[PDB]
UniProtKB/Swiss-Prot annotation:
Pathway: Cofactor biosynthesis; tetrahydrofolate biosynthesis; 5,6,7,8-tetrahydrofolate from 7,8-dihydrofolate: step 1/1. Transmembrane segments: none annotated. Keywords: NADP, One-carbon metabolism, Oxidoreductase. This is Dihydrofolate reductase. Residues 5-191 form the DHFR domain. SUPFAM superfamilies: Dihydrofolate reductase-like. The gene is DFR1. Signal peptide: none annotated. Key enzyme in folate metabolism. Catalyzes an essential reaction for de novo glycine and purine synthesis, and for DNA precursor synthesis. It comes from Candida albicans (Yeast). It catalyses: (6S)-5,6,7,8-tetrahydrofolate + NADP(+) = 7,8-dihydrofolate + NADPH + H(+). Its EC number is 1.5.1.3. GO terms for cellular component: mitochondrion. The lineage of its organism: Eukaryota, Fungi, Dikarya, Ascomycota, Saccharomycotina.
Amino acid sequence: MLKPNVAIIVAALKPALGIGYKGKMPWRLRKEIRYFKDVTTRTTKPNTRNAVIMGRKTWESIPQKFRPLPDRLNIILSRSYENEIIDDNIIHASSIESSLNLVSDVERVFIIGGAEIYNELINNSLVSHLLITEIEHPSPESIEMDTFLKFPLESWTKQPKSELQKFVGDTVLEDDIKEGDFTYNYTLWTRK
Ligand SMILES: NC(=O)C1=CN([C@@H]2O[C@H](COP(=O)(O)OP(=O)(O)OC[C@H]3O[C@@H](n4cnc5c(N)ncnc54)[C@H](OP(=O)(O)O)[C@@H]3O)[C@@H](O)[C@H]2O)C=CC1
Ligand SMILES: Nc1nc(N)c2c(Cl)c(N)ccc2n1
């Protein structure tokens, strides 16, 4: 696959854009996990699938019994890996672009984390869209976080919900979803 458009998908707590703590997500938002699953799995073309790219630490954080993520091509990046097709669902690679050379019959490509991957790949011009779940809490400072997004948002434009809807197709997008003390909304951003 040559120069595909790539999307980053992440959930962050405003205003600092915290995304983790000691290797885990600092929240368990049931509806959000379901949205992640649907957006990253659904395709429109016929015999295609989407590809999810992640850092080695992220891969290792998924219980072995629950990986690879089903119904998607999984690509794991490590600076120590040789470009290798493990099986039909798993690819090992040392760079995003090399990994993409190994794929065919992929519709969309998503970067799913973690922090290091995100903070590095945001500056790669292959990244054309950001799907950011913006999470709000009454006392954000009470949530322990050690990992944050460092995205140059001044170079990106948040699109209206209509554009997000068009992006996701059929997926139901509820507004101001509440789960415990968290309130969240899905958003789409494109480069200026
Ligand atoms: N809020 C959210 O939506 C999400 C949050 N996260 C959070 O992220 C955190 C984990 O992030 P982090 O620890 O940084 O882990 P990552 O998943 O980003 O893995 C980092 C590893 O990826 C490899 N890697 C990193 N950059 C590159 C590169 N540019 N090219 C090739 N390989 C590269 C390296 O592997 P090697 O060392 O083998 O070279 C590095 O050690 C947790 O807190 C987790 O909860 C994760 C996903 C979503
Ligand atoms: N928005 C969004 N983005 C991710 N990358 C997510 C991941 Cl990897 C897990 N595991 C769960 C929810 C997510 N939610």
